[PDB]
Curated annotation (Swiss-Prot):
This is Bromodomain-containing protein 4. Interacts with p53/TP53; the interaction is direct. Interacts (via CTD region) with CDK9 and CCNT1, acting as an associated component of P-TEFb complex. Interacts with RELA (when acetylated at 'Lys-310'). Interacts (via NET domain) with NSD3, CHD4, BICRA and ATAD5. The interaction with BICRA bridges BRD4 to the GBAF complex. Interacts (via NET domain) with JMJD6 (via JmjC and N-terminal domains); the interaction is stronger in presence of ssRNA and recruits JMJD6 on distal enhancers. Interacts with NSD3. Interacts with NIPBL. Belongs to the BET family. It comes from Homo sapiens (Human). Phosphorylation by CK2 disrupt the intramolecular binding between the bromo domain 2 and the NPS region and promotes binding between the NPS and the BID regions, leading to activate the protein and promote binding to acetylated histones. In absence of phosphorylation, BRD4 does not localize to p53/TP53 target gene promoters, phosphorylation promoting recruitment to p53/TP53 target promoters. Changing D103G: Found in a patient with a neurodevelopmental syndrome; uncertain significance. Residues 16-122 form the Bromo domain. The NET domain mediates interaction with a number of chromatin proteins involved in transcription regulation (NSD3, JMJD6, CHD4, GLTSCR1 and ATAD5). The C-terminal (CTD) region mediates interaction and recruitment of CDK9 and CCNT1 subunits of the P-TEFb complex. It is also required for maintenance of higher-order chromatin structure. The record marks N98 as: Acetylated histone binding. It is found in: Nucleus; Chromosome. The chain holds residues 43 to 168 of 1362 of the full protein.
Length: 126
């Protein structure tokens, strides 16, 4: 079976809204989410559907943009670094699991190049 997805709401975890988190939702996530290659990354890796019985024996910290979108829209995060780390983990998971040269890796690398551009433009905290 698939594991439960990463949590997106937890009453015990404090949260805030900042201009950097709003930029991560309206600019960074929005740019990647609408990209032609977004869709393998728009929901948790479905190892059952994809017939990957080893995926969740290898990847300890799965992450995907559907999870990140909900985390931002429902204020799961305290700071922008947590969200940036989620994006970074999503990319490195892809590079750990897949063969170099697989199409999913080329897709990840195109999204990552855009992510890096957008994050360098992160606004000073207001
Ligand atoms: C290992 C891994 C896999 C994927 C990933 C995620 C979702 C995917 N949905 C499909 C197809 C399956 C058949 O029904 C139509 C959709 N593929 C297969 C085609 O993917 C491709 F287009 F990219 F080639 C999916 C693959 C996502 N990350 C992050 C992975 O590491």
């Amino acid at each position: 079976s698939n594991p439960p997805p990463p949590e997106t709401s937890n009453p015990n975890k404090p949260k805030r809204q900042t201009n950097q988190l709003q930029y991560l939702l309206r600019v960074v996530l929005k740019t990647l989410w609408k990209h032609q290659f977004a869709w393998p990354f728009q929901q948790p890796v479905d190892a059952v559907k994809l017939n990957l019985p080893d995926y969740y024996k290898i990847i300890k910290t799965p992450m995907d943009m559907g999870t990140i979108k909900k985390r931002l829209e429902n204020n799961y995060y305290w700071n922008a670094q947590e969200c940036i780390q989620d994006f970074n983990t999503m990319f490195t998971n892809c590079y750990i699991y897949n063969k170099p040269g697989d199409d999913i890796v080329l897709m990840a690398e195109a999204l990552e190049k855009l992510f890096l551009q957008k994050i360098n433009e992160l606004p000073t905290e207001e």
